[PDB]
Amino acid sequence: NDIQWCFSQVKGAAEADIISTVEFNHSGELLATGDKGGRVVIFQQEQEHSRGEYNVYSTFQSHEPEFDYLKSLEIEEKINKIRWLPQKNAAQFLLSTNDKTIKLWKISERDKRPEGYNLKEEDGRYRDPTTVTTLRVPVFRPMDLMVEASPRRIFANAHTYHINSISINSDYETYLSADDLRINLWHLEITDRSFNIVDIKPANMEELTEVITAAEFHPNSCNTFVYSSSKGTIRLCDMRASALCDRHSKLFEEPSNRSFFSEIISSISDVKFSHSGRYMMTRDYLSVKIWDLNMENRPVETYQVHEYLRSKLCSLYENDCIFDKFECCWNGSDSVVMTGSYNNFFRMFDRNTKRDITLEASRENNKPRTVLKPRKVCARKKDEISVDSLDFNKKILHTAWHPKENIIAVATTNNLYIFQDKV
């Protein structure tokens, strides 16, 4: 039943080095991660199912720190989201976004260089031009393989607030970017203008009550996208109905837990469409809810990430941990969903069997093909971990699942863990 996950690799070891996003590419051969320092590191799987290890493939500075001279504020270079485009040709394309700007990066391999000169040598030593009589055209020669990353297009100056989501449309042309209050529609080949489809900004900001937390395009349908709000509701929009998507087509929201923190914990931090596209998953602070797109009134499945923290919300509020934005991700078959937790714990929920397992990404098990022992949290029998002993600084916010294989990338604060199914 349960998948026996095994330690495969650990990479990484300061604030600048903290990983802020993780994303496999469509084929799953490439794995990209971003950090608070604006750097993007791409790992390529060894292609010698495939269980080859991942090795550094490319590294570039996606974003640089900048100062907003209009608002007189600093602009963070932290990488919020990375999205791979479908492979157009031999090269690889991905979208990298910070709070303000989205950059389209091309990663291409070069294995040849020009050789031959008419007015000088390869060393740069010139010669008298009077003696140059016969012309010769340079000829390309093989060279050691190298990977080059360059910024092709920059989408900037469009968002007044901090960008939180980017999602590529299935039409291969457009993608959306959602800030706190606006969603803008972009054309991948046009940077000078954008289309603002959704704008929930109130006339008087004093009356502000909702902010957009996440947005995503439907994997198959080109006209369907959803966006969640801080109030815990998901609005599904149909671009076919009208040019402006202010009027949502569907609204997903549920009707003993009316505590002071109910408002805070209800905010949806991440929303993910299933690969099949029939189901939708949302992650709030305490639970993962899976929504059938044909049932607005309630989710079809609900899973508790960590119930033991429900009684400790007061402590979490004091140390600001209650505002953490955890993520979630489906597996290739949509049968298992993964989400992170505290103390370097990440949770696997099997929909078919309704079984749960808690796993720890720790260097203590730093031995290849070593089975991860399921963890248990108690509020203490043998091998159980006391709730009071949990370290809330160790947060697993960002995780990714291989699109086809049982390979998962789990990012701690400073280390990236890759786990593989026992084979």
Binding site: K88, P114, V132, T134, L135, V137, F140, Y172, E173, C222
Partner: protein, 581 residues
């Protein structure tokens, strides 16, 4: 003398994009010097796949490769240019691929029929069957050029390859196939169009992707023009009807945007039966964009209707919908109608225009939005020849006055631009009684741009009403501003004289306008004084030689003694230009 060529060849490796770009643009010079034989064996392999991939550099490279046929040895060796262009037809940039495809089409004509089947047709197959959809996207644009000049066996293969592209998994490929479907059908035989084009056209029109379906509207126009009228009902109309009723507003927008093109293709008989009901739905579409697009086509669509029922259909079917559009909430929809609704007057005639169209004109003239009001005023010629402007005069005037006095100066600017057009239409007599006061009020407007526009407005008005009207009406009033306490307004008189002198002629300028300019030379404000020097410079040539030596020269000489530096400089310049000193 080969050193300059060596510099260009080396610059191809230069890191500087600008220097490398310049060398690419001069590839003809490099190829010409190297020779025909060396170009094929040395230059082209270097250009076959260049590591540098700047869009501007690749775009320039694609353009040059399309004119290299002579440099490579003529048509006998034209196929040597394919590998360089095949690589360019695979890059990620769209414009580079489009240019590369254009170059391939250009050189295809120079391929002999044997060469096409030996070198060019295989190239299309490689691109069509390539693993990267960028290559397959480019392949769509190459079928039409090679199909006509190949044997029947090769033609059958090409049609099969094109069919696979229309069914490609990637929407990018399918969009290209839909775009090129119309032209490919133009070269196919009529039998294959009915048998092979239509199934592909039908399948694409029902594609899941909205961006793909909307391209089927264009293919509908192209295919309709090819098929006989009797076959349109069976083959084309079922797909066209679905497009007008498509759930996606984008698809319906294309139908509205190209409605007139559809009207010509289908013919008058189909237009009455199907298009007219479809047009009514579009004008009542829920999306504002679709309604605005339909509004632009109201005039053209009604014009093309057959005379047997044109008047009846407009009055009974189209006209009621227009009334709703006039009161449309969306600003842009109302603006679209205003620019074209005036064109229905000739079609309906005098009696119908007064009874039905005229109330609509009055309603839009009173609309709050300045754009709607401006559009109606700008297109009064369509109604002048039908019912006469006198009937509209008493209703146009209140609208003009409000526009002329709008708070936003840019709104006031817009009406000024149409003033000479209205003045001619309304006649001299009406202008003097009603519109003359408005024109003068602009000359003293706070905003300089309005005063500048009004100054040029006088010239255009004089060009129509003639010198005599200007002397009696305009000149005595503009000269009155010379005494204005504000120096900005006093300079306006000089600006008016500068433009008026070009038309008012020598006699009027010397006797009435020139004395005022000379008097202002003693103005206490330096700004006025050196504008007099500039004014004399511009109108000096129009004056007689005797006048220049008698009056203009002594005044300019005095200005050169003025304390202010600017007055002396322009005074000196005026003398030099006029050759007086």
């Amino acid at each position: 003398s080969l050193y300059p060529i060596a510099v260009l060849i080396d610059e191809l490796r230069n890191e500087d994009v600008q220097l490398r770009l310049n060398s690419i643009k001069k590839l003809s010079t490099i190829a010409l010097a190297l020779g025909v034989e060396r170009t094929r064996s040395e230059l082209l392999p270097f250009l076959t796949d260049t590591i540098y991939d700047e869009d501007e550099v690749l775009l320039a490279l694609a353009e040059q490769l399309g004119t290299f046929t002579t440099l490579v040895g003529g048509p006998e060796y034209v196929h040597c240019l394919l590998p360089p262009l095949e690589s360019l037809a695979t890059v990620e940039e769209t414009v580079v691929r489009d240019k590369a495809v254009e170059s391939l089409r250009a050189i295809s004509h120079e391929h002999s029929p044997s060469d096409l089947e030996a070198h060019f047709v295989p190239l299309v197959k490689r691109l069509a069957g390539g693993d990267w959809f960028t290559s397959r996207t480019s392949a769509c644009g190459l079928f039409s050029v090679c199909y006509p000049r190949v044997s029947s066996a090769v033609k059958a293969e090409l049609r099969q390859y094109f069919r696979n592209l229309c069914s490609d998994d990637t929407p990018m490929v399918r969009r290209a196939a839909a775009s090129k479907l119309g032209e490919f059908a133009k070269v196919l035989e009529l039998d294959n169009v009915k048998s092979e084009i239509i199934p592909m056209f039908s399948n694409l029109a029902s594609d899941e992707q909205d961006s793909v379906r909307l391209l089927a509207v264009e293919a509908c126009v192209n295919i309709a023009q090819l098929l006989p009228q009797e076959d349109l009902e069976a083959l084309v109309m079922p797909t066209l009807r679905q497009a007008a009723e498509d759930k996606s507003w984008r698809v319906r927008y294309m139908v509205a945007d190209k409605f007139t093109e559809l009207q010509k293709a289908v013919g008058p008989e189909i237009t009455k039966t199907d298009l007219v009901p479809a047009f009514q739905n579009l004008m009542k579409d829920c999306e504002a964009e679709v309604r605005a697009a339909a509004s632009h086509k109201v005039k053209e669509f009604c014009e093309n209707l057959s005379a047997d029922c044109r008047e009846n259909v407009i009055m009974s079917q189209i006209l009621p919908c227009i009334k709703e559009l006039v009161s449309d909430a969306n600003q842009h929809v109302k603006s679209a109608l205003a620019s074209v609704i005036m064109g229905l007057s000739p079609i309906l005639g005098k009696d119908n225009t007064i009874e039905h169209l005229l109330p609509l004109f009055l309603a839009q003239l009173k609309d709050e939005c300045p754009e709607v009001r401006l559009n109606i005023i700008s297109n009064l010629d369509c109604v002048n020849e039908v019912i006469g402007i006198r009937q509209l005069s008493q209703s146009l005037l209140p609208a003009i006055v409000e526009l002329a006095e709008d708070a936003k100066w840019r709104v006031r600017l817009a009406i000024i631009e149409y003033m000479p057009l209205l003045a001619g239409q309304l006649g001299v007599e009406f202008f003097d009684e009603k519109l003359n006061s408005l024109c003068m009020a602009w000359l003293v407007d706070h905003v300089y741009a309005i005063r500048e526009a009004a100054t040029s407005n006088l010239k255009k008005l004089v060009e129509k009403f003639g010198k005599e009207w200007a002397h009696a009406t305009i000149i005595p009033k503009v000269l009155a501003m010379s005494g204005d306490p504000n120096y900005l307004h006093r300079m306006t008189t000089l600006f008016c004289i500068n433009v008026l002198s070009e038309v008012c002629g020598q006699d009027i300028t010397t006797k009435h306008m020139l004395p005022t300019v000379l008097r202002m030379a003693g103005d206490p404000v330096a700004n006025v004084r050196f504008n007099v020097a500039k004014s004399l410079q511009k109108i000096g040539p129009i004056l007689d030689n005797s006048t220049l030596q008698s009056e203009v020269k002594p005044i300019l000489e005095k200005l050169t003694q003025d304390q202010d530096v600017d007055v002396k400089y322009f005074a000196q310049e005026a003398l030099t230009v006029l050759s007086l000193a």
